[PDB]
Every structure is written in structure tokens, then in C-alpha cells.
Design a protein around this ligand. Structure first.
Ligand SMILES: *[C@@H]1O[C@H](CO)[C@@H](O)[C@H](O)[C@H]1NC(C)=O
Lengths: 533, 535
């Protein structure tokens, strides 16, 4: 009974496991319950604090992954499977993991809380890419990750109802943050220095915690990687959530109270079966059950909230990867596949745009096509392919991120921005997808430090660099190594200068304007095209 | 005759002409100036088609330029060369339908290629007698027969009651067509080859050239065409029949006036009255808009130029087209608040938004928003220098550069041999400020070879440059190809194609080949903006 692996939290005792990281041991506490299992009558409902437990709860193993769609587009392919559940599915999934240095830190240590992506329909804190051992070992970071409900279970709302208020997945996260405030000191984490970080939907979730007052007392800093609360995909209106919930119910054979009672009687997989048959249009980067603008958790739209919010005593790190949109195209854009080079035609491109920007009118779609057509090579297949990728990445990530960075900086935040441009050597996706959505995570988490993963020496040093930026940010609100001069400084992002840095194998390069012209098209023009028409 | 220079006595269909031996730098040229090609379009003939000049008797003196067609005289900057060079340089009179011929001296033995100049001036001004249209250098240095003609401008050439007998519109264009006919019949008298006639013109001259391309009865009258910074298509060169009716009726009201009764009243008005009100008839506050322009009459122009270039068969056609670096800069001082020749014209974002409304007077709110969006540099959205240049670009692109791209594109796609240029050399003698760059109209002096006149103070490189340009142009006139078929050292000027979109830079440096004529930006004006404005 190693006394370093034995901790007492408000609910009782836990016993972790000593895990091996390349440069030494780390204490891991895996599958710590933070909520009552949200099962039976508690499906679709807000989480409640886990009741205390007797004796020593075994926290040496990852708990169940929340009930979700499992991906089958490319069975047995590592590129898709790395995002697939790696533990048993179960509605009983409200668990969090903690990694600390071994021995557990002597002084209060900054806490990083990870919030996975997965389009609000999938994900799990237990994937290899979110492994906290390296950050814990190399940087001395106390790292926390939590499971939160996804799909219908986390996000199906009948807004205004008592039994499906919506945003419960987000409340799952909030409860885990609450859990951190109350318990992390026991692990030698500093509750007064909690940085949230997340990618894709996890990034949108971080952004919603920024935009939701009761979350603000629970962290001091945020990192949003390739995702935002604003933009086309991260939220739906009350009216729209009701409609999909209503539609899914009918689809599974089901007054709010009565409708929800019936949904609660259905096996999990039944709801997941028809999850994807509620989207209003054929569309990539669109997700059935996502956070709802409820006038509660989110008092207004994220757009409204970031335009008017006061972000003065807040530090934010935000960024994107070089090819945000490539990944998504192979999920229903004709002409796109991982298996060939996906050189498309002009016609495939116009049809592709109606899917990538599914909310767009004929006119708006035309505006898009005409903006993204390189007019010197109008029908070049490489150009059209790369442009399709760009349309989707810009619409869904880069421009919402630029939009967020701008508003936050204008309104008092300290903002640091990046673009991630190193394609992992081990990437199993074809070359044309470039640096796809999500392939920066393994690097931030420090996976290349595991010599058995066959990442290049260079990639290992890169990963060390990134872990340093992220943890320096966690530590100070500033990603710069406060002992260094060689390698330029990472300047804050501002609305004036619009400075961001490229993250890749070369030293930091400062660039200005993050797709400034193209994001002006998305953030300023297209709205007007739809608000008048 | 008897004691006169035997090289200066020519006969044409209407009689005998005495010309004048002129001194050019490399030797003498024959000039026949002020040859009437039409009955004076006066009195009851104002607004009417030109009637062919009735034969005269005796020897017509053709040794001086004739009257300039009645027109508005620019006063914006009194004393200033930059504006005066464009102002009438002979008496203003409605009796102005004369033309000029420059040939070698002595006149060539074998028939030589004819270049016919059609001057610009927005269809409200111009004269074939301005110094920058001096045909002597092209005549002396390239052995060209150069012909230029006056055509009625403003109301006299373009006021139209479409459908009426007494003011059918496009008569200015018909003046041009009459001089083309005169060339067909008479040019061989001068050693000109009527079977090798190249039209070239700039701005409204270029637009004019393009309308001859687009109007079948003019097609038989020339073989090759040069359009300099102007096109029959685009937002300024034509008006709908309805809009010309509107402008003409309104002008009539303004001066005190059944179409017959109205036109008859207009004909009783002094010429100067019409000029005094010609600017009071435009629908919006605008620059690069002109009141009385070619009308889409279903006669001269059987459809809109856009429709005709979209669907025309241009198989035989050889066309040279291009633009100056800063097409728009000139126009900004003529009524965009903020802009002037006397300072750097650094403007505010506000002045930019307002300038866009004036520069694109046909744009709805959303359309203008799009323009502003497209031309703003979002790195420095408030920068006065960018905003100034952007304002220029907007006006330049919308009126000239993108029309030329649309034209070049359509013509190429439909059988034409198109050669394309961007002229980027700023005259060392330019009197406009530096910020205006290479303004609209400032390639003309080079094509015409003025720098060859050592009294004009052009640099030696400009002299060599002018010669180069004269060579490009007259080769194109001669062959349909601006390239020198010998000189293979010099980089070749490739045709412009939809595939490769090649055009050449014209400046002091040897030819450079570039691809795409503001391709991205012109897709906005040519492909997107129309679609917007269907909403
Ligand atoms: C050209 O230069 C000479 C220099 O002696 C000067 O006297 C003359 O006024 C100049 N003329 C022009 C065209 O400006």
C-alpha cells in the first residue's frame, strides 16, 4: 500500500496506480466518480454530486466511456479508431481522471483540465491521445480529465421542460470543475490556478464555460484548440433543439413530461440509432445534439455573449491546425476519400459547398464558391480539393476562432493565438488531408516522448516545446518561457496587430492576420447576405 | 495648282485636297487635316444621323485642324497641363465632322496598313486634334497611314429618344462609321490599304471600337481592333433605351422643352445651353458616369454589349486590349470628397465608404458593402494610404480593368486572337501627383510616340520605350500580331487565352508575361456582383 497512491477526497478514499512515464513515475487516479450515475430517471437530467463511499475506492483503471455513436466509416483503420471508445460504453460514465507527479507535488501545482472533443456526440477522457502522464512527469503538471455525457444523453433538450433542460453534458463538465475546486488540493493541485483546455467540441465547451457565469468561479484561464462557442455547429436554438428532440422521440416511437418519460424507457442504443436522422440538411461538421441557447447556462447566443462580454481578467490561448476541414470531407462529401488523392471536379465542388455550408442559400453558396475558386486555375482538381477543405475549415473553425480571438482581445482578455502546421510523421491519413483536425493533440499531450511510438527525435523536441508553452500558459497566463531569449517571443493577439505564431518544427514565426480577408468574408459579409438577401 | 508641292495634292470622292508637309523628328510627313466626311450636323440635322459630305469644288485647304465638336470644357484646375491637354484646341462648333490623315512623305508606293484613331473623353469630350493624338510620329517612323476623326459628343452625338425619327441616338457612333466608310472609299488615294484597317481608341474611344466590333454594318469597315482602357461592355459605355429616354426628356425639361415637338424644341436651343445642363441629368452622384452615351437601341446595338460578347462569333477577330496601372485615380478628384491633385489624398474609412457609393453609383446597400468588404485590407482597415489606393482600385476595376477582363475572356473563348497588356510606365513629364500612379489616358502619348520629339523633355529610355510601343501597335495593325517576326531575342507576347490568361507588362523593362488579369477581384465584379444585384 503505497501511501503516495492513497488520497482522501470529500467522498472518501481512493487508491491510484503508479504509472511509468519515460523520465520517471507518475501517480494516476483514474475513474474517480464525480456524479451519481445519470441513469434511469436521471437520463437527460442535470448531474448530481456523487454520494460518499465506504473504504478505499479503486481508482487505478479508466471507467466506462459515455454512451455514444461508434465510428464505422473505416473499420480497423487507426486514423478513425483512435477516436473510438476504448472502454465499455455505458450511461454510467460520469468519472474523472487525475495525473500528478510522483511523488505528488510538495507545493500547490497549477491544474490543467482537459475537455475532449467529438462533436458533442462522442469522445472519452481515456483515449491514448489524452494521456496525462507526460504532462504530469515532464512539467510537474496536475492534469485532470472528465467524461461528460454526449449525444442525446448529454444534449437532448426540451427547452423549458423540467426533465430535459438541455446542456447536461456541459453541467457534467461544470460538476467536474466544481469537483476540482473541492478536491484537487488533496492531490497537490492548486485550485487557485486552474486552466481549462480542450479541442473541437471540447474547445467550444471551454468557451461556454467562459461565457457562463457560474463556471467562471471554477477556472482562471482557458485554451481553445480548433473550436469555439460561436459559429455554425456548437450551439442550436431552443426552438431547434426542441424540434430535433421531438423528431428523435417520434423516430423511436414516443406534453414534455410524457415524451421524456418515454425516451427514458428506451435502451441507450435505440436513441443512438436515430441520432443522425434529425439534422435539417445533408451536412458535414454538423451534429445532432449540441449545447442549446437556453437563456440559462447560455443567457444569449455565444455570438451575443462574446460581443458584449467583459473579459478583462482572463487569459486565453486559441488556435487552429493547418487543415481544419480535410478530415470532415470524407464523411459525406462525394469525391472525398482517405484511400485515393480525392482530386475533385468543379461540379463536385459546388455540390460539396452545399454540404459544407448547409445553412447557405443559393446566393451565399455562390458567394462561397466564387471566393474559393482560384480564378487562375478555375477547374484544377488539386485546387478545388484543397479549397473544399478550406471552405469547411474556415467556416467551422478558423474564422470562428479569429472572430473569438478578436472579440476577446477587444474586450479586455489577454489572447495568444497559434496555427499548428506540423503533420505528425505517424499520421495514417493520406497526405492531402495535411494537418487534420485533432492531430495536434498527441503533441500537446507529449506522446512523442514515448519512444515506442516511433515519432522522430525532432517531433519529440517539438512536443517538449508545446508542453512547455501550454504549461507556461497554465502557470502564468503567458505561454512564453520566462527564462529564454533565443526563439522570438510569442506576442499577444490584438485586434490592431492580429499577431499569432506558427507552431511547427522551426522556431516560432510571428504572423499577422489569421485568414484576415477570408474571415472578413465569413464574419462580416455572409451574415449580411442572410440578414437581408 | 502649278507651284505647289506635288506630294500634297490628293483627290477624294468629294473633291481635291491640299495637304501640308509637316516636320517630324526623323523627316517630313504628309498631313491632310480637317477633311469633311459629313454634312455639317447643324440646324435641323442636330441629333440626326450623319449625312455624307456633298462634293465641294476647288481645292479644299486641308492644312489645319478643324472645329472641335461642341462640348463641355473642363475647368476643375485652371492653367493645369494635366487637364488642359484634354481640352478643345480649336473652336467649338456643331460643324465639326472632319477627319485627319497622316501618311509618309513622299506617300508610300505600295498600299500600307491604316490605323484609325477614335479618341476618348467619356462621350462628352474629345477631339482628333489634341497634341497627344498627333499622327506624325506613327506616320514618319512606322510608315503608317493614320486617320482620326471628330465625332459628336455629349447631347449632340448621344441624346436619344429611342424609336423616334428625329433623335434615334448613337449618332456619334454613326459619325465614326461614316469616317470608316470614307476611309474604305478614299484611303487608297493616300496610299492606304483599305483592306488593312485597324481601329484603335482609348476609353470611350476603346468602347467605341468595341461597338464597331459588335455592330454588323461596321464589321466590313475594319479588320483589326485595339481597345485601350475601355470596352463596349461595363457600367458606363451604354444606357438602356428607357434610361436614355429618361435622361433626354429630363435634359429637355431643364432647357425648356410626342417626341417630334420635344426634339424640335431642343433643336432651337443654343448649343451652349445643352452643354450647361448635360451634367444635371445623371440618376446618382457619380464619377465615371456620363449623361449621353451609346444607347442599346436594337439597331446599332442589337442587344446589350454584355449579351453580344457573351454570344458573339469572333472567329476572324484580332484584338489588342489593355489597361494602365491606375485606371481609377484620375476620376477620384472629380467628385470623391477627400481626393485632390494638390495633396496625397489620404482618406478616412468614412471617406472610403462614401467614395464607394459614388464610384459604384448603381450599387445597392449590400452590393456596396461587398465592395467595401472586398477592398478593405483587414490587417490595416483604417490605413489612409491603403484606403486611398483602394478607392482608386474600386473605380479603376469596376469601370475598366474588369470590363477589359470580361471582354478579353469572352472574345478569346469565342475565336478571337486577343493580346493583352497592362501599361505601367508613368511619364517622367506627368503633371498629376505621384499618388495617381499611371492614370487613365497616360499611355496614349507613348503609343503615338510623342517622346520622339526632343522638345518634349522625355528621357532617352522613354524615347526607346515609345518606339517599342509604336512597333507593337503597328505590327499588330500589319499582321494581327504585335510581335516582331524577326526579333526573336525580345520576349514574345503570347495571346491571351481562357486557359493561360496571359498578358504582358509594358514599361521600361523588357516584356514580362503575367497570368490572370485581376482574376480574383474581377470574378467579384464580373461573376458575383451581377448575381447579388438580382436581389
Ligand atoms: C524642356 O526643357 C527645357 C530645358 O532647357 C526647358 O527650357 C523647357 O521649358 C522644357 N519644356 C517643356 C515641354 O516642359
Amino acid at each position: 500500500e503505497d501511501p503516495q497512491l492513497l488520497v482522501r477526497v470529500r467522498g472518501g478514499q481512493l487508491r491510484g496506480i503508479r504509472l511509468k512515464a519515460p523520465g520517471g513515475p507518475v501517480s494516476a487516479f483514474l475513474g474517480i466518480p464525480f456524479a451519481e450515475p445519470p441513469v434511469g430517471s436521471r437520463r437527460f437530467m442535470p448531474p448530481e454530486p456523487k454520494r460518499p463511499w465506504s473504504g478505499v475506492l479503486d481508482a487505478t483503471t479508466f471507467q466506462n466511456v459515455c454512451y455514444q455513436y461508434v465510428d464505422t466509416l473505416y473499420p480497423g483503420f487507426e486514423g478513425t479508431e483512435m477516436w473510438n471508445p476504448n472502454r465499455e460504453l455505458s450511461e454510467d460514465c460520469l468519472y474523472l481522471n487525475v495525473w500528478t507527479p510522483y511523488p505528488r507535488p510538495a507545493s500547490p501545482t497549477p491544474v490543467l483540465i482537459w475537455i475532449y472533443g467529438g462533436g458533442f456526440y462522442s469522445g472519452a477522457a481515456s483515449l491514448d491521445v489524452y494521456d496525462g502522464r507526460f504532462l504530469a512527469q515532464v512539467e510537474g503538471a496536475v492534469l485532470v480529465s472528465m467524461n461528460y455525457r454526449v449525444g442525446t444523453f448529454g444534449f437532448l433538450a426540451l427547452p423549458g421542460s423540467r426533465e430535459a433542460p438541455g446542456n447536461v453534458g456541459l453541467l457534467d463538465q461544470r460538476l467536474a470543475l466544481q469537483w476540482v475546486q473541492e478536491n484537487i488540493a488533496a492531490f497537490g493541485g492548486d485550485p487557485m490556478s486552474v486552466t481549462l483546455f480542450g479541442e473541437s467540441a471540447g474547445a467550444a465547451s471551454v468557451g461556454m464555460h467562459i461565457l457562463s457565469l457560474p463556471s467562471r468561479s471554477l477556472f482562471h484561464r482557458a485554451v481553445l484548440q480548433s473550436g469555439t462557442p460561436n459559429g455554425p455547429w456548437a450551439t442550436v436554438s431552443a426552438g431547434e433543439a426542441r424540434r430535433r428532440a421531438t423528431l428523435l422521440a417520434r423516430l423511436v416511437g414516443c406534453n414534455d413530461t410524457e415524451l421524456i418519460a418515454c425516451l427514458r424507457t428506451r435502451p441507450a442504443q435505440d436513441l443512438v440509432d436515430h441520432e443522425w436522422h434529425v439534422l435539417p440538411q445533408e451536412s458535414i461538421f454538423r451534429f445532432s445534439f449540441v449545447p442549446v441557447v437556453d437563456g440559462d447556462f447560455l443567457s444569449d447566443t455565444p455570438e451575443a455573449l462574446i460581443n458584449t462580454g467583459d473579459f478583462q481578467d482572463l487569459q486565453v490561448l486559441v488556435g487552429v491546425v493547418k487543415d481544419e476541414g480535410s478530415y470532415f470531407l470524407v464523411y459525406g462529401v462525394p469525391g472525398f476519400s482517405k484511400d485515393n488523392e480525392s482530386l475533385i471536379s468543379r461540379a463536385q465542388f459546388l455540390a460539396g459547398v452545399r454540404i459544407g455550408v448547409p445553412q447557405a442559400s443559393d446566393l451565399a453558396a455562390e458567394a462561397v464558391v466564387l471566393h474559393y475558386t482560384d480564378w487562375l486555375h478555375p477547374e484544377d482538381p488539386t485546387h478545388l480539393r484543397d479549397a473544399m477543405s478550406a471552405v469547411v475549415g474556415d467556416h467551422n473553425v478558423v474564422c470562428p476562432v479569429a472572430q473569438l480571438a478578436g472579440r476577446l482581445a477587444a474586450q479586455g482578455a489577454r489572447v495568444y493565438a497559434y496555427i499548428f502546421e506540423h503533420r505528425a510523421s505517424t499520421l495514417t491519413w493520406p497526405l492531402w488531408m495535411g494537418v487534420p483536425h485533432g492531430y495536434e493533440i498527441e503533441f500537446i499531450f507529449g506522446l512523442p516522448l514515448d519512444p515506442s511510438l516511433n515519432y522522430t527525435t525532432e517531433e519529440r523536441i517539438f512536443a517538449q516545446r508545446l508542453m512547455k508553452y501550454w504549461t507556461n500558459f497554465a502557470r502564468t497566463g503567458d505561454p512564453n518561457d520566462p527564462r529564454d531569449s533565443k526563439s522570438p517571443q510569442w506576442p499577444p493577439y490584438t485586434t490592431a496587430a492580429q499577431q499569432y505564431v506558427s507552431l511547427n518544427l522551426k522556431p516560432l514565426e510571428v504572423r499577422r492576420g489569421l485568414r484576415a480577408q477570408t474571415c472578413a468574408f465569413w464574419n462580416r459579409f455572409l451574415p449580411k447576405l442572410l440578414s437581408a438577401t
